[PDB]
Ligand binder design. Structure first.
Ligand SMILES: C=CC1=C(C)[C@@H](Cc2[nH]c(/C=C3N=C(/C=C4\NC(=O)[C@H](C)[C@H]4CC)C(C)=C\3CCC(=O)O)c(CCC(=O)O)c2C)NC1=O
Ligand SMILES: C=CC1=C(C)[C@@H](Cc2[nH]c(/C=C3N=C(/C=C4\NC(=O)[C@H](C)[C@H]4CC)C(C)=C\3CCC(=O)O)c(CCC(=O)O)c2C)NC1=O
Ligand SMILES: C=CC1=C(C)[C@@H](Cc2[nH]c(/C=C3N=C(/C=C4\NC(=O)[C@H](C)[C@H]4CC)C(C)=C\3CCC(=O)O)c(CCC(=O)O)c2C)NC1=O
Ligand SMILES: C=CC1=C(C)[C@@H](Cc2[nH]c(/C=C3N=C(/C=C4\NC(=O)[C@H](C)[C@H]4CC)C(C)=C\3CCC(=O)O)c(CCC(=O)O)c2C)NC1=O
Ligand SMILES: C=CC1=C(C)[C@@H](Cc2[nH]c(/C=C3N=C(/C=C4\NC(=O)[C@H](C)[C@H]4CC)C(C)=C\3CCC(=O)O)c(CCC(=O)O)c2C)NC1=O
Ligand SMILES: C=CC1=C(C)[C@@H](Cc2[nH]c(/C=C3N=C(/C=C4\NC(=O)[C@H](C)[C@H]4CC)C(C)=C\3CCC(=O)O)c(CCC(=O)O)c2C)NC1=O
Ligand SMILES: C=CC1=C(C)[C@@H](Cc2[nH]c(/C=C3N=C(/C=C4\NC(=O)[C@H](C)[C@H]4CC)C(C)=C\3CCC(=O)O)c(CCC(=O)O)c2C)NC1=O
Ligand SMILES: C=CC1=C(C)[C@@H](Cc2[nH]c(/C=C3N=C(/C=C4\NC(=O)[C@H](C)[C@H]4CC)C(C)=C\3CCC(=O)O)c(CCC(=O)O)c2C)NC1=O
Ligand SMILES: C=CC1=C(C)[C@@H](Cc2[nH]c(/C=C3N=C(/C=C4\NC(=O)[C@H](C)[C@H]4CC)C(C)=C\3CCC(=O)O)c(CCC(=O)O)c2C)NC1=O
Ligand SMILES: CCC1=C(C)/C(=C/C2=NC(=C\c3[nH]c(/C=C4\NC(=O)[C@H](C)[C@H]4CC)c(C)c3CCC(=O)O)/C(CCC(=O)O)=C2C)NC1=O
Ligand SMILES: CCC1=C(C)/C(=C/C2=NC(=C\c3[nH]c(/C=C4\NC(=O)[C@H](C)[C@H]4CC)c(C)c3CCC(=O)O)/C(CCC(=O)O)=C2C)NC1=O
Lengths: 102, 172, 161, 72, 226, 162, 9, 162, 172, 172, 162
């Protein structure tokens, strides 16, 4: 029970009316408007028909770095955005245990 | 800078496939909301200077140390710059409201604005208080049933509040 | 108490065997996660005060508890409260950095429920304060280490409840 | 508690030994011994709960705290 | 005595970045060559003003009126406009008097040439010249230099060059935003220990709380009918 | 003059390209919202004199010292009143030019440009003209989309003089 | 301790 | 800050040369007219509060709707009167800074720069402050060249706000 | 950039009060010293080239490392730069002598000069030796009783020595 | 920006001495190799576009995910940028081949190119694969005995391989 | 350093293109006139000390007050004479660097740039160095095309210091 029933403040409350969004925005995808997203946008199912290719053409690879344009369009590159990932928290920032010289 | 449509298209090209029927149905939905969107932006631009002025008066009424001696806004010049910053943030919120995506507002307004307010010594937290005031006043004007046909506008108001929360997020 | 290493030597010892490949895989797991734990304990060590301040500000302030009538109303009780929170943060860091919550069994959760139900400390509010420390601490140390810290804060919350 | 939390066991043992009580009873040349205190509250019963317990007979605490006293 | 030689760095300024059809992100191309009527002149005067100064300042006091009137009647080129404009005392009081001599070059390049500086080694050589001869011959160099004559010509107002690379929208921080008038390096030598960040304002009313999945507010979407 | 079609053409000129589908859609949109704007222009032109006299009298009722104050700038004489309904007349006619053109071109050109030196040098307070435009915005008597048009450009003038 | 007496073991 | 010594120095800096005899003559002229300026600064400082309250009351007597108008910008409340004597106090203090400095530097920097956007955006008519400055110029009670100093800088402020 | 008067005024605005009679009496004292100030600056500018040249010859006479190949003053170019720097520091000491406050000198001359001499590789300590030489020579000319009426100038000489000690302070 | 001769002269001035007879004999050797140097540069520039195009085809034949959707080479645009980058790498290798010293190539081409390919997200290791291909192709054309008289050019080919190894060294 | 190879490279860089046949012909011409240049560099290097002392003594015979005048700038002391043969040594060494490089790059960089402020600020008359270079041009003792090389660069130094 995360909701503040036990320790009670009158001011914290559910968003009963459209007026007063002012006091907060949704943070997760589950907390959202019915047709919306955590940010203010219309939900898109993100599934479409991949352009069919020739059998001589090599097939698509799943583990490539995602295209740089894709990340920026979601907006996650900006530090203010919630989902941001700090560069200090990368696994590349560690001394790897398997390396002999370390 | 991308709109909603550019964003949908840019993702679909990064995967490199055609759009499905489901996606195009969702875009039909976005167009059907498009008139209401233009209406809200008309209300914000049509009363923008009273939003900036009223929210500035409430700013200086709440904390009185932005206008006193030693305050960042104490000089006539620095007061003019203060009301400028509020007008600019309102301007980019107007842009990102029409676009549907906040790529403009993230690109031009809030990119290294934090380190600028470091380098000037301006309290960024007080700027977040100002942006809270423009959010409250402009949402209060966006919900106004005046000269405008009847319907529902809750999702679009929630979108607008998301944009102001990006502004107040990144100035601090 | 015991860490993950001691637990491995407990199982391998109590079977009488030596160290087989499974136990060495467990020690390799711990020794992979070791550095991450170190830097997490470093960050929590740095910002303990601000963890307790932000978590009390989220969870307990401006409510019936700090209003009169509330458990935290006097300055004596406020200071005892934030003292108690400090213990939860400190021993949760020990539990993270050992990789085994046996410390929380030995020196924290033993007799604590009888103590707070003796004094009149509300368990509900305590748990919500600890979860506030979990969210603030996870915000400081990041995702992975926040999962580790979260498990031990959830261990103490499961202990009191 | 505040002594234990603030510093640790070393301060705690130094405060138990360097107390007025320990100096009055034992002074310099007397090993501490089991005694049966009479005057305050539950001292006689609680020491009877303590010294009738062997090492490791239970982890359960004999005196967790005292009751809810009215006032502060 | 000539200028120091500074090794060049690589940036977006020097590549063809070929586009058959110009993006939507190119700069407006204010130019005296296509012939402006009154308004299309007013835009050039204000777009000059924004570039040389900043989004802020401007206003009433600083604006130089006679260079606007001379420019409208074709007496000076846009290049000369920016020149005697940079020399104006209003600009000297608002940017030159505050800045360290090695930072001012950092502003000037970025507003006059529209490119970031290659390295510090650039900054230092240029910095030596202004002090030795004043702000004048410094601006004389930058404007008369082949970089400026080629990219902008005499008739066009200088802007950031190749700020956004193709499809990506991250861009680079705009110069007005990126290097304002004051700097930290100057404040360190004329200051004291500075308490840098004010803590986020705290209020009893949260005015920040996220809306949960359970809440009724999310389901605001439809009126009674349709 | 900043008109929609000409901003489309100036955008394509600075792109150096032919008119592409984007700005053709732009001129289309102007051609549809034009109908409502033309209705509004017809009826502001129809009620012009009534609105100007009403707007002036609104200024006098809101600020009564304007009538009382002896000066050249203040409307105490008949001369001052003449200049007053002259100026209000200016704003109303510029709004109708903006409704006809369909952007803010005429007000930005003929009126807004250089206004601070006028209202400064002749000590004209802009609050006066704000009060007049608010009156015109209240009683122009349009309805529906035409009313959104007129309110848009009137409010634009108020934001400039704000 | 490193050597502990569980009835389980 | 635009001070005569620093104009001399900035001129010789932009020329990149040492201080020649011309600007040494300039600093001499400053060093002579300084004495009368400092006397005027002493006596404006001495009668400061009387000048502020007298000037404010002159503004209210010239424009009585300021007291009568119900609004935030108008001095109807006690708060508006406090802001009134606050602002007039700012003008008088900047005049004393210009008297001390010996040029219009402090008024040009702290006060004059960006003023039209303040008096615009908060709807402050400049005629009010013009009336205040004319009262301060009438009853500051200086005499001789000190009076020419204070009348010079006060009249400068009137020309800016004109 | 401030003189004495701008310094007092800027502090008095940061407190936001009018000045006292004690302050204005002190300013009367500064003006009464003002003729002597103009006299010193006239002596410095009237013999500035011989100051720079003679102090440079004494510099290269003391340490001959610089003139030798691979020395920082070895090339014709770099010798011209060396004499430049001496001339500039002497120029800003002339400015700060007229102003009465070292805000000009701290603003333009000595702001990041140290890290410059790092980034060039020029030893800043040798520059401090040069500025010591200009201090000794220019004070020796400032105390000269030549074609000028007799009086006391010890406070002003102490002031000038303070300015040269700021220069040699901040180049190292 | 220096050739071989400027490098020797600049060292000799940094020590500040005359050149020896041994140095001038070595320079006579460099001139005697100079005709062969101009011949190599003629071969490289005379077939440069086939070098860039063929090494690009081999690049996209080895790894297909530069040209795969989501790849750096997916859009007509980004493919044009990849080809242009190779030309520059080839252009500055032509410059440093004529100069004899890699001062030009270290100055203009490979100065902060690594951090650029970080800031773009382009894998620099793939660029190293490309430059390996241009090295193999261009050395294979440099050793061609076609319309050119016979002799030995192994030292100059080794020099050219050193320049391409600088390029592939500094892009990674 | 302004060397022919690097002028070719800088020209093609500023044009942004590959090295074309034109500048390859340029580097060929450098590679041919190089032979006579290197002979001249060898024999100037061989007779260096003799040229320096003879040139200095030519300066003292042409201007005898240089020995007679008591000064730091004039070669009256032994120190002065040491600086004298030092400086003439500098000019001869820069000429040999230009012979080796094949253009005027070393003299233009290490020597010529910034020279007027040296010969001005230390009061060094250029006529002294002119007389020295004319003596070196008279008795360097080269013959043929190598003599045209050394007379070219020596005469260039005289035209700069002229
Ligand atoms: C160029 C300028 C320009 C505008 C300003 C708008 C104005 C406008 N809005 C609507 C239409 C609409 N506008 C709104 C907006 C409202 N919802 C409410 O709850 C509030 C009262 C109000 C927002 C503040 C709604 C809900 C509709 C649809 C009405 C309906 O179909 O019932 C329409 C009819 C066409 C359509 O359905 O989109 C028009 C012309 N359109 C334009 O072209
Ligand atoms: C494109 C977007 C964009 C922005 C968002 C602004 C941001 C911005 N503001 C300032 C500058 C300023 N901004 C303010 C504003 C403030 N006054 C206060 O009392 C408040 C804390 C705050 C308003 C909420 C002030 C006072 C200055 C001048 C600061 C000073 O000179 O001391 C500057 C430096 C240049 C200048 O002086 O104008 C910049 C870049 N500028 C841009 O180009
Ligand atoms: C506003 C203040 C201000 C300064 C204080 C100077 C500081 C300064 N000096 C140099 C640059 C220089 N400064 C010197 C000076 C030296 N020669 C030596 O033998 C000594 C160690 C030392 C004199 C004591 C030299 C030789 C150079 C040129 C260095 C070089 O190019 O190798 C440069 C780089 C630009 C240039 O080449 O001019 C700068 C910024 N410039 C300024 O704008
Ligand atoms: C193109 C647009 C355009 C305008 C909007 C006007 C604006 C304007 N008004 C005046 C001038 C004037 N305007 C007024 C008007 C006023 N009388 C009052 O009692 C009220 C406060 C106010 C009417 C609401 C008066 C009285 C004058 C003359 C002022 C004077 O001479 O004292 C002037 C100076 C020239 C003149 O004397 O006519 C100008 C430029 N002129 C233009 O060209
Ligand atoms: C550095 C110089 C400097 C100034 C000169 C002032 C000028 C000034 N005054 C106000 C603001 C104000 N000024 C007044 C003053 C007035 N009340 C009246 O009855 C008279 C007409 C007038 C006094 C003669 C009032 C009442 C306000 C508040 C207006 C309002 O909120 O409605 C504001 C907006 C910020 C605020 O609310 O304080 C500013 C910038 N501020 C400065 O920083
Ligand atoms: C515009 C430029 C300008 C100047 C440069 C000065 C120069 C100057 N100084 C004095 C006058 C004077 N100057 C000095 C100064 C000196 N005291 C000493 O111990 C030192 C030798 C020397 C300072 C280094 C003194 C003492 C007098 C007064 C002499 C006397 O009355 O005996 C006078 C005569 C008028 C007077 O008494 O003030 C003048 C014109 N005045 C100017 O208008
Ligand atoms: C201005 C531009 C310019 C050029 C590009 C060259 C081109 C060139 N090369 C040679 C001449 C030569 N070039 C080479 C070079 C080669 N050795 C080999 O093993 C390889 C096939 C090839 C280097 C890649 C050789 C070996 C000779 C001498 C051939 C011989 O005498 O047998 C000659 C004849 C004159 C001479 O002997 O030097 C010429 C004109 N010369 C110029 O003036
Ligand atoms: C003066 C020297 C100089 C350089 C060396 C380049 C370096 C460089 N390359 C790019 C930019 C680029 N460079 C490449 C090249 C690559 N494609 C791949 O598949 C490979 C990994 C790699 C070739 C080996 C690509 C694809 C881009 C565009 C990247 C993108 O927009 O996603 C950019 C950004 C500007 C632009 O888009 O052009 C720059 C500065 N530019 C210069 O001015
Ligand atoms: C890189 C090129 C380069 C040069 C060409 C010299 C040029 C040069 N010469 C001197 C300095 C000097 N040069 C001479 C030389 C002269 N004695 C005479 O009798 C004749 C007129 C003349 C020789 C023909 C003397 C005497 C001095 C010292 C002057 C003095 O201190 O009085 C100085 C000042 C520094 C010093 O004292 O050494 C310089 C820069 N230095 C360089 O770095
Ligand atoms: C009956 C004995 C008693 C006292 C005194 C008491 C104080 C008390 N002060 C609090 C906060 C506070 N108290 C202050 C007080 C001040 N700020 C300043 O700068 C001034 C020096 C000072 C006012 C004079 C502030 C600012 C806070 C909130 C700080 C914050 O939340 O960031 C809180 C936090 C939560 C809450 O108030 O509900 C308590 C419990 N509680 C008690 O039971
Ligand atoms: C690590 C081993 C250990 C722990 C954890 C511990 C807890 C502990 N908490 C206590 C009291 C208390 N604990 C609290 C705690 C709270 N009040 C609130 O409102 C909050 C919601 C909450 C904390 C989050 C308060 C107010 C008291 C004081 C009750 C009183 O004596 O007046 C006491 C009684 C002694 C005293 O503080 O005066 C103990 C012994 N003791 C231990 O030895």
């Amino acid at each position: 029970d995360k909701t503040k029933g036990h320790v009670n403040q009158y001011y914290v409350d559910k968003f009963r009316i459209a007026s007063d969004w002012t006091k907060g925005t949704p943070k997760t995808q589950a907390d959202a408007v019915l047709g919306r997203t955590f940010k203010g946008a219309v939900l898109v199912p993100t599934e479409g028909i991949p352009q069919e290719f020739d059998p001589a053409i090599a097939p698509r690879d799943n583990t490539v770095d995602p295209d740089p344009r894709i990340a920026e369009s979601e907006g996650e590159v900006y530090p203010w955005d919630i989902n941001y990932f700090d560069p200090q928290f990368l696994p590349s920032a560690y001394s790897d245990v398997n390396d002999p010289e370390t | 800078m991308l709109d909603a449509f550019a964003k949908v298209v840019a993702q679909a090209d990064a995967r490199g496939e055609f759009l499905s029927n489901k996606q195009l149905n969702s875009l039909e939905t976005m167009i059907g909301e498009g008139n209401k969107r233009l209406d809200i932006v008309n209300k914000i631009n049509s009363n923008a200077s009273t939003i900036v002025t009223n929210s500035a008066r409430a700013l200086f009424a709440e904390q009185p140390q932005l206008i006193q001696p030693g305050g960042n806004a104490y000089t006539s010049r620095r007061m003019a710059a203060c009301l400028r910053d509020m007008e600019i943030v309102l301007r980019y919120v107007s842009y990102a409201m029409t676009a549907g995506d906040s790529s403009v507002l993230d690109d031009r307004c809030l990119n290294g604005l934090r380190e600028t307010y470091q380098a000037l010594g301006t309290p960024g937290t007080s700027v977040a208080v100002a942006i809270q005031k423009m959010k409250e006043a402009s949402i209060a004007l966006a919900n106004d049933l005046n000269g405008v046909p009847l319907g529902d506008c809750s999702s679009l108001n929630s979108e607008l509040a998301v944009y102001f929360d990006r502004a107040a997020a990144a100035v601090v | 108490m015991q860490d993950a290493i001691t637990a491995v030597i407990n199982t391998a010892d109590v079977q009488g065997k030596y160290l087989d490949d499974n136990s060495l895989d467990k020690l390799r797991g711990y020794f992979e996660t070791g550095e991450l734990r170190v830097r997490a304990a470093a960050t929590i060590a740095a910002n303990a005060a601000t963890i307790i301040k932000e978590s009390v500000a989220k969870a307990l302030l401006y409510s019936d508890i700090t209003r009169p009538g509330g458990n935290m109303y006097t300055t004596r009780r406020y200071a005892a409260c934030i003292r108690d929170l400090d213990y939860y943060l400190r021993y949760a860091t020990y539990g993270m950095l050992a990789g085994d919550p046996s410390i929380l069994d030995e020196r924290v959760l033993n007799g604590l429920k009888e103590t707070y139900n003796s004094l009149g400390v509300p368990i509900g509010a305590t748990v919500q304060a600890i979860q506030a420390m979990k969210e603030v601490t996870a915000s400081l140390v990041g995702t992975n280490a926040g999962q580790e810290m979260a498990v031990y804060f959830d261990y103490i919350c499961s202990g009191l409840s | 508690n505040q002594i234990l939390a603030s510093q640790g066991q070393v301060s705690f043992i130094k405060t138990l030994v360097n107390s007025i009580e320990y100096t009055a009873l034992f002074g310099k040349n007397i090993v501490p011994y089991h005694r049966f205190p009479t005057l305050p509250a539950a001292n006689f019963p609680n020491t009877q709960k303590l010294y009738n317990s062997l090492l490791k007979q239970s982890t359960q605490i004999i005196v967790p705290s005292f009751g809810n006293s009215v006032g502060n | 005595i000539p200028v120091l030689n500074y090794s060049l760095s690589t940036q977006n300024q020097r590549v063809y970045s070929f586009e058959y059809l110009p993006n939507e992100e190119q700069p407006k191309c204010y130019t005296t060559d296509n012939l402006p009527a009154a308004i299309e002149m007013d835009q050039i005067i204000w777009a000059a003003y924004r570039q040389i100064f900043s989004e802020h300042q401007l206003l009433s006091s600083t604006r130089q009126p006679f260079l606007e009137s001379q420019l409208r009647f074709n007496q000076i080129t846009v290049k000369d406009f920016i020149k005697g404009l940079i020399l104006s005392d209003a600009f000297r009081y608002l940017n030159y008097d505050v800045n360290n001599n090695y930072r001012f070059v950092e502003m000037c390049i970025q507003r006059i040439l529209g490119r970031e500086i290659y390295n510090h080694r650039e900054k230092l050589a240029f910095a030596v010249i202004i002090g030795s001869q004043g702000l004048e011959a410094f601006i004389d160099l930058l404007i008369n230099s082949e970089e400026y004559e080629d990219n902008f010509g005499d008739n066009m107002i200088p802007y950031q060059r190749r700020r956004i690379i193709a499809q990506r929208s991250k861009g680079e921080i705009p110069f007005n935003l990126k290097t304002p008038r004051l700097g930290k390096d100057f404040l360190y030598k004329q200051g004291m220990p500075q308490l840098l960040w004010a803590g986020p304002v705290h209020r009893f009313r949260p005015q920040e709380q996220s809306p949960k999945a359970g809440d009724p507010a999310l389901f605001l979407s439809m009126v009674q009918d349709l | 003059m900043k008109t929609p079609i000409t901003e489309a053409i100036a955008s394509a000129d600075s792109q150096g390209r032919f008119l592409s589908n984007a700005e053709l859609q732009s001129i289309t949109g102007r051609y549809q919202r034009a109908s409502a704007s033309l209705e509004a222009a017809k009826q502001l032109t129809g009620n012009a004199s009534r609105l100007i006299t009403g707007a002036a009298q609104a200024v006098y009722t809101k600020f009564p010292f304007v009538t009382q104050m002896p000066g050249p700038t203040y409307a105490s004489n008949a001369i001052g009143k003449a200049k007053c309904a002259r100026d209000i007349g200016y704003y109303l006619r510029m709004t109708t030019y903006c409704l006809v053109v369909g952007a803010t071109g005429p007000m930005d050109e003929y009126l807004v440009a250089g206004l601070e030196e006028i209202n400064r040098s002749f000590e004209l307070s802009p609050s006066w003209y704000i009060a007049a435009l608010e009156n015109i915005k209240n009683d122009h008597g349009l309805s529906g989309q035409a009313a959104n048009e007129a309110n848009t450009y009137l409010d634009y003038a108020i934001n400039v003089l704000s | 301790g490193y050597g502990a007496y569980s009835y389980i073991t």
